[model samples]
Each structure stands twice: as structure tokens, then as C-alpha cells.
Target chain A: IPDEIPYKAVVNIENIVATVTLDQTLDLYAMERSVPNVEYDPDQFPGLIFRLESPKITSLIFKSGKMVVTGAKSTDELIKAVKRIIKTLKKYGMQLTGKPKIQIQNIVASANLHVIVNLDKAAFLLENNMYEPEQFPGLIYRMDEPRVVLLIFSSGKMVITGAKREDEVHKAVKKIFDKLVELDCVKPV
Target chain B: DEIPYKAVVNIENIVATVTLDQTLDLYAMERSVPNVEYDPDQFPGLIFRLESPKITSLIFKSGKMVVTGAKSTDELIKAVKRIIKTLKKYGMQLTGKPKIQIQNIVASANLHVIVNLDKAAFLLENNMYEPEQFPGLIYRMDEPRVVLLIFSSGKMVITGAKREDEVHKAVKKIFDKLVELDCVKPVEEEELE
Candidate 1:
């Protein structure tokens, strides 16, 4: 024996998609002319598109003084994104003062494992699993307990979405990954 | 007067962070702070859910914390200050002014025109459409990059823009492409009677 016991590691949710709200009404037409990062063609939709370059976040601004943003890895990133918007709009003489509020509406996370999975079998093992190679390549698994969805592929690259918090990612991944073991997807060492 | 469009940007949530000057007593914070969750064995962070701003903050032994779910920046500062104020009252000493920082921001938008999912993906090689599972085409753009979930109902959700300009650019790029592909029938032409 080499006196070595390998450490145990599990899947962790890495990337997250969170939706937050701002209480300021931003005029997209003015921004489209000067700011150079806004797209507001009402011939298509009612919401204006606003985004930040540093944190790489997107916010949907409505005429009614409301917005929804995404692309935050953590709650901290979310705050930085909103503040940046405040400073940027200040240059345009848009003043509602203070920092706009942010509310996280949804989150997306992904995990990886050095193991291959049988997508054909995972469809049955995972209740409400959607796997259609012809229509889509990824297998969708909707777990009920915490209510998070996981996209499991044959390559062990999983994407989790529709989570209210990060806790759901942990619970859902552990719950489903363990089920993978029981179903003989990953061999027991 | 600028050509006014019937739309604008809105802030939906705010997430902030703070760093205390001195080390924290996780055990003490747990006892003092109401609605706090901590388990060193299962996880290394303490999760504190505040009621006023309705934001959840993650505190660590290294004196770092991440507060999430505030509706505005004002709420974000208030939430972080609440923690600092509470910790001090509970006998947690501070070294200096509590410095609060912003971490991330998320927002949503729409195309406002009916999008043909099948045709939309056909228009772009970087699109993923699976209407059977999710009735939206996941379109990933490269420059001023962003991810858009396009639905046939002409509604689109924009994510991954770090700044307001990115959101504008991404939506413009996609909208222009859709118009170029003749796949968009903007609401301006249709009477929804």
C-alpha cells in the first residue's frame, strides 16, 4: 500500500444567472444615441435593452421604471453591475440618485466531472428527463425537492437552472449525482 | 428632444459585499443574529437572511461577506450597514469604516416582435432551439457578447451583459439579424384584435 487515500471531491455549481431589479426609469432612446450600448426599437418589443461591460450583465429596462438583469456569478457581482449603471447614466444627466436596487430572480450554475455518462439510461433514471438528440443534445433533469433543473450530457458537463438560491444547486446536484451512482452510471470506487 | 421609444431599463435586484476590519465570531454571530444559518462541517460560510432589505448575506471567517437580493443600491448599502451595526451591538469589534462593494448585476429585456424559433436558429449558427422542453431558442452572441432566450411570443430575455451598452449592442445585433433574415414580424405591423 502506498499509504495514500484519495480525497473525495464532488460536483459544484460554478456559473450562476441571477435576475435583479432596478427602480429607475431609463430612457433607452437617449441612451441609444449617446451611450452607444442600448437597443430600443419599439417596433419589436416593449422593453429596452441595457447592459454593462465590466461584469458582463444585461438588464431589461421597461418604460414603467423597472428592469431585470442577468449574468452574475455571485450576489457580489450583481451589486457591482447595478452601481456601474448608476455612474454611467449620471453622465447622461439621468438623476434619480443613490444606487438602484437589485433583486435576484433566477440563477444558473454548471459543474463538471471526469466521468462519462449514459444519457440514454439517465433519461429514465431521472424523472421528467428530456433527452432528444434530434431536437436537442442535452438531457434535462428537473428535481423536485429544491426545484432545480440540471442539463446532463454524455460528457459529464451539467448545467443547472431555475434555482432560487445556490443551496438548490448543492442539494440538486448531490441528490442527482448520487442517483447516478445507484443507477450504475459512475462506478463505485 | 430625443426620438422617444416606448421602452427603458429597470433594476430588479441588488447584491452587495462588505469586509469587516477584524475577525468575526461565527459562533457569536449565530447566537446574536436572528435567521442566520451556519454549519462549518457541511459548508464553510455563514448564511444570514435579513428581513428589512430582504437580502441574504454570506459571511466567512476571513471577514468577507456577500449580500444578495436587494432591490436597489440604497437597499444594498442599508443591508450591509445593518450587519455592521448588528455585529457591533453584539460585541463584535470593528477596525475601520465598513467598506461596501458591488459584485454583480442582472437584467432582462425583450425583442417585442414575434420570433420564429425554428427560423431564428436557422438564421444563426450559434443558436440552440428545443421548443419541446423549453419554448425558447438559446442564442449566444460573440461581440458585446450576451445570451438571449428567444421565445416565439416575440419576448426575449437578455443575460451576461456586464454593462448597459452590451445589452443594447446584443439586442441590436440580434434584432438587426432577425430583420435581415426576414424572420421578424414586429408588433407594429400586426393588429392583435
Candidate 2:
């Protein structure tokens, strides 16, 4: 009567978060005045936030001349997102002293175990496990080794974060699934 | 005031503890892992001098392993995934999933300012120093628990940190100290171009 996970379902790539250095600094006060839809509240947060509509990504521009792009579906999309920010800033009379380069900081991807899980048992499985469905619907499992945090659901769906490469997404998922089976939380049909 | 610029410290190699979830047949891994070098008589771990990501992995019989030589965490994750899929082709349906723990992360960055080895040796004589035998200065920091190889060319490599935040902190500690202690030499001015 309990839900058992099905085999043969592979993980799929989801979001990629990459960082870049403009090699140039932006004046946030001036940028906020000229740029459309720019968020800069130095009292609240240090970085200037810009949202991209095309690829539906968000970038945090810092005073350290670093730009962090998150929510990119692919690495190529991350590159494009960076390019778009450059053009948009130029339109607002912002001058970039040098060409910017993108570096991947972390990538996040989601997967489905294709089986329901018992959250109560999962809570005690690992030292880093955090599951409070009342506060949040998903369980947060943080892995220190691979440097990834997973959001686990009773439905066996998972979201992996803090990974800079797509391969890490699948790797973390497989690891989580395996751990679940080991704990008797996930059963294979 | 000029904007302060710092060298970018990126993740160079990620050494993680990973397992294939089931006991592997070492004799079979020679064919599965590309360019694998395994001599059970010499070592218990199967060493794979793999290319591509160019890292080495020491695989054991109990389905436990240590994967090194990954340029990025992603690459190693990818390598492990592919390794699992490849081994399954050999007709071994591995039951469990690979579990990983980050054992070490090696990061590299540039200090941007050149270092003077003789001056460094004179200052950090006990815990850090430079050797005439090598071009880089060998130093150890206690907080982040990392080793640093500082070169005159401004290139630096950091290892022995267990967390990502530790990497940044390790680099920052040395960078701040170098700046404060007058270890980082001055930059030469550009002649009239």
C-alpha cells in the first residue's frame, strides 16, 4: 500500500548559477537612477540586483566587480545572460572599463526519485538533515563533501543546489537516492 | 579612490570521497575505467590515471573510493556518473547509489603583487619560509587549515581545506597578512606607451 520508487528514471539538468567579473566596477547609485528595474538598497543588501526576462535569470552585481548569475537553464544561457546585462548597462550610460568574463560559481538541478519517501525516517538518516514539512514542504539535506544541498519531498522529488556543474546535479541525486534506500526510506519496486 | 582589485581564486581540483554503492570487481574496472592502472599486489586501491578531467581515483573492493584530479566538482560528479553507467554495461547491476563526502578542495589564485622570497623567509622563518630548491614559498595557516605555495609570479595554490568557505578564508588571511606585513612587493610602473 506504500509508495515504492520505480527504477530507470535518470536525473535531468535544471538551473545553472555562474559568476563573472566585469573587470569593471559599476556605480550602484548612478546605476539605480538610470537603469530600469534595478534593485539597490545599500542599507539592506550590498549588491545591485538585476533580473533578466529572456532566460528568466537573476544576477547580483557587487562592488567588488563581481557579477553572479543564477537561474540559467544551461551554461550557454548563462553566457548569454551575462552579455545581455552588459548591453543593458550600456544603454543606461554605464561604461565598462574592460570586457567581462563569466566563471561558474554553482549550479542547481532537480530530479525525481520516482518513488514516495518517508520523511520521518529521513530526518534521522544524516547529521545534516533538516525536515520540517510544516515550516517548509521539503526536507533540506546538506552534503559537505560534494558541496551540495538538496531539497527533498515526500514524493521523492529533489532539488540540488551549490553545484557548479551539471554532472554534480546527477551525482548528488544518485547519492541521495542510494542513501535513502540504505536507510530503508526508499524501497524499489 | 581607485577600486581595489583582487585575483580570482577558483576551484582547481575537488577531491571527494565517493563509492559505486556495490563492491566492484577490480579486474573488471581495468576495462571500464579509461586508462586505469591497478596493481592489487602493490596497493589495495585501484588507481585510475584518467584523462579528460585529468584526475585520479582510488577505488577499493568495498565500494568505497576517493576521487581526485577533478578540475571542478561538476567534472568529478560527471565522471562518477559515467563510471557507474559504464560498469553497469558489464552486467553488474549495482544496487546502491554512490555516496560522497568532500575530503579536500584545492584552489588556486593570484596575489597580483609579486612576492620577495628572501624577505618572506626573513619574516616568516618558523611557520613559513622559502626554499632555494623551489620557486614557491611554503607556508601553513592554522585557522582554515590549509597549505599555501606562494610563487614570485604571484600565483598561489591552496590545499587541505574541507569546506568552500575555508578556501576563501585561507586566501584572505594570507592576502591580508601579505598586504599588512609588507611581504607583497611593489608593482613596477608602465613606461610611456
Candidate 3:
């Protein structure tokens, strides 16, 4: 008997939200005048909405020189986007005294187990899981080990959120898949 | 001078089905042949593994066989002919010509550019992008009739193609779309600060 399963699970990093600190004070009014295509309104919002076109990341820039970068698919892309944003700032004549420090805040990923799962059975067997078909077609599963929330659908599709690192995403998916298989709540479709 | 980068598609696996005119006897073949595995309780098809080109085929009693592990049509044809020849050599009667149909082709491609998936998802049609659901944008291309799992890292997995050319066409079409929509970023380029 072949030990390997026929179908393989596919996991993809969707979004990475990171916090960036420039370690200096940023003048929002000066940024609003210098940066091209930036949205800054002190009355509506305090942070400046700086959007990049290429990697397509959006950052919320605050007066304290802190930023929240979002919509990056991977850490490599995230770092590239951050560098590009700083380049753009420098091009627009924003004085930077120190290098930017970046830290990952959250990572959101999606996965396909490629097998049909019995959500009703899984919800019953798995702990920290909620399944109300009328309210939501997917089962809300919160894993304690990786500390991520996964939305599992009957179609064997999942959306994992609240992971701090990419490895956590893979770990959570693999753990949940193994648990489902151990409980006999999943079958190859 | 900047060199034009084209996405390269690699055919990873091909699955095809072959139809024979005569019904096969699994019991007789398993008893007569040396390496034929047949256990009806576990699986209905008999397992026939080829050693040279490295292909595994599942032969059913209905004269239909599902062939897998061929990287291209050339190898697929070779594997099918070898399987039939081996069966014939083992004193199995074969009267009709085998009809081969390419079922699916799985291929991977590298676009060599980072794609702005959020923008692409909004611009393109017949695409599903629930960032919460799946990271890769699932695009059902109408031309080649292949589904592409397009990622932001400029990699794609093309599926549901019946031919190798379909996979190539699908990759080319999607790459053109990404370029035209201005949704791609050059990889590893230093911007003037």
C-alpha cells in the first residue's frame, strides 16, 4: 500500500500585515503635500493612506513615523514593498533619519485539502469548532497550537487567519487535516 | 538592455484513458503475468507498473485503462504501447486498436514578476479572489478552458487542460493579461532612492 495520499494539499499566503517604524517624527501635512496619490485628512483619519501600485500594498502612515503595511502576499514581497515605499518617500523629499524596522503582525492564508470533508462530523469531533450551516456555510475552527482561526467549508477549502508567521499557517493546516483524517471526517473526493 | 522575460511552463503530470474493444480478465492476467497486481476487494483495477518510462496504469475489466505519470504525449504513447505489448507477450488475446484520450494536464509556470493580485482580482472577469478563502486567484480562462491558480509571487498552477498546447496557451494568455492590466512588478529590481 502506498503511504502517500493521492491528492496533495495546497496552501497559499494571501495577506501579510506588518508594522513598520521609521524611528522619527513624520509630518502628515508635509507628507500630504509631497507624496503623490496619498490620502491624508486629519479630520476623517489621522493616518495617511499610502498606496503602492506595483506590489499593491497599502500602508497607514501615522505622525509618529509608524506604519501598518497590509495586502502583501509573502514576506519577500512585503519587504520589497516596504523598501519601495521608502524609496518613494525619499523621492518625494521626505527626510528619513533612521532605517525602517519591520515586524509581522498577522498573516492570512488559504488552503485546499483537495478532499471532501464532512463538516457536521468534523464540527462534532473537533474542539474549538463551531458549525451552524444556516448562519455560515463554513465551520469556524480555532486552533490553539498555531493560534489561528480557520474557516473550513464542506468543499475541503479553508481560510486561515490570525497567524503571525507563514510556518504557522502551514502547521495549522497540516494539523487540522491530520485531525480530520484521524477522526474519519474526511474522504477523498 | 533589458531582456524580455517569458513565462516557462513545465508539464508535471499527464493522465489519459485508453479504451480497448475487448473486455480484460483480471484473474487470468494476474495469474499468468508476473508483475500484474489484482485485488478486487481494494481497487477494481489491476495495477500495471512499467519500469522503463516509469508509468503506472490501472487496467479495469471493462477494457478501459487509466494511465498516469507520463510527462508528455510522446512518453504516454510509449507507455500505452509497452503495456499492450507486455500483455500480448504474456499470452493475453488483444484484438482491437486502443483509443487514447488525454484527460488532463497539470503544469506549473513562473511569470518572473510579482502580481498585484488585489488589482488583478478586481480587473479580471471569471476570477474568484476571496483573500480569506484562498490566497491564489482562481481564474477560469475561456479560451483554453483551463483553470489557473495565480499567485502574487508570479507563479501559477494550470489545470483542466486536455492538451499540452492548452496549458501553454493558458499561461501565455494570462501573462499577457497581467502585463496589459499593469498588475505585475519586476522581480528583484532596485529603485532609485
Restricted to chain B, the TM-score per model reads: 0.76, 0.79, 0.90
| C-alpha TM-scores of all predictions | 0.48, 0.45, 0.54
Writing each residue's lDDT as its tens digit, candidate 2 over B77-98 gives 8877766665566555766676
* Residue range A38-129, candidate 1, lDDT tens digits: 87886655566777776677766666666655556787777777667656766766676554555555566667644667785565334445
Cα-based lDDT at residue A167, candidate 1: 79
lDDT of 2 by residue, A76-156 (tens): 787777888889988888778876777776555667788777886565344455454433456666576677666688887
By lDDT, rank the candidates, best first. Answer: 3, 2, 1
The TM-score leader among the candidates is 3
DockQ of each: 0.02, 0.01, 0.05
| Rank list by DockQ | 3, 1, 2
Which sections of candidate 1 miss by over 4 Å? A1-189, B1-8, B97-99, B188-193
DockQ score of candidate 3?
0.05
Better of 1 and 2 by lDDT: 2
> How does residue A8 of candidate 1 score in lDDT?
32
Best by lDDT: 3
The DockQ-based CAPRI class assigned to model 1 is incorrect
True contacts kept of 2: 0.00
